[PDB]
Amino acid sequence: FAHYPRPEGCSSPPNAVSVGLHMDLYNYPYLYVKNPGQCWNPEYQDPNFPRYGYKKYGSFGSSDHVNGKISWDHNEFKEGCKPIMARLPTAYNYPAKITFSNFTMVLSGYFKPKSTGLYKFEIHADDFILFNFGSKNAFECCNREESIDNFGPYVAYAMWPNEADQELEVYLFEDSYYPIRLFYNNREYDSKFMVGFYPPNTEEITYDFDGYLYMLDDTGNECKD
Numbered sequence: 303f304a305h306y307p308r309p310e311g312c313s314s315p316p317n318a319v320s321v322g323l324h325m326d327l328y329n330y331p332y333l334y335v336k337n338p339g340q341c342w343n344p345e346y347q348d349p350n351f352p353r354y355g356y357k358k359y360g361s362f363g364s365s366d367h368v369n370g371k372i373s374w375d376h377n378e379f380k381e382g383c384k385p386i387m388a389r390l391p392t393a394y395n396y397p398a399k400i401t402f403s404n405f406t407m408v409l410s411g412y413f414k415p416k417s418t419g420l421y422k423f424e425i426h427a428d429d430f431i432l433f434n435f436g437s438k439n440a441f442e443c444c445n446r447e448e449s450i451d452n453f454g455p456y457v458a459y460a461m462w463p464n465e466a467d468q469e470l471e472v473y474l475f476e477d478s479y480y481p482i483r484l485f486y487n488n489r490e491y492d493s494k495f496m497v498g499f500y501p502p503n504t505e506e507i508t509y510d511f512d513g514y515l516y517m518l519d520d521t522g523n524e525c526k527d
């Protein structure tokens with residue numbers, strides 16, 4: 303905390319590497335819906351929700367090779383307490399409309415820095431973003447699918463309205479693929495999933511992950527082979 307974080311990453315040969323992150327989409331129902339108390343579900347506030355509670359309403363979709371402009375800011379919605387259909391950014395490779403007003407998303411895979419140095423990430427959430435990062439915080443090297451819910455204490459915890467903005471700095475090495483797990487929830491209305499970073503020596507933030515997101519084969523033995 304007085305020094306900067308220096309997380310652990312993974313090694314892999316080039317032949318086991320493909321582009322983009324994996325996405326799972328989960329239902330997050332309203333308590334009740336109006337027209338043709340509070341309406342929204344507080345379950346996302348449960349401490350157990352990020353580790354297993356988030357699957358309890360079932361899934362509805364998934365995609366792979368998620369890459370590029372993965373952030374969004376949907377503040378155009380007009381009606382609350384009501385499902386609103388919209389499409390994810392094309393980065394997600396998911397054509398169907400989702401209940402953008404109310405859904406849960408888990409994004410996982412690997413971050414590779416374009417140069418060795420200190421990276422600062424910034425998240426802005428409506429409603430809820432969790433950020434895990436590193437082979438000892440997000441998931442095990444080459445064992446993502448089996449270990450995806452064994453993440454550690456959060457690297458950033460962003461919740462609307464109060465802690466909605468968070469930041470963190472990690473010194474990362476160019477040659478290494480760092481496990482990354484991004485958890486997102488919208489409970490209702492407006493939806494903001496904004497994840498950006500300032501690369502080393504860079505003043506302007508970027509929200510474009512193109513060339514930074516990769517997937518490794520889940521071949522196990524800490525990627526030996």
Ligand SMILES: OC[C@H]1O[C@@H](O[C@H]2[C@H](O)[C@@H](O)[C@H](O)O[C@@H]2CO)[C@H](O)[C@@H](O)[C@H]1O
Pocket residue numbers: 341342381382383428429489490491492493
């Ligand atoms: O301001 C973002 C915040 O809005 C809440 O939704 C409100 C909505 O703004 C209001 O127009 C409607 O009448 O009631 C809603 C609350 O029941 C969201 O709940 C919150 O998640 C954010 O989206």
Ligand SMILES: [Ca+2]
Pocket residue numbers: 428429488489490491492493
């Ligand atoms: Ca919301």
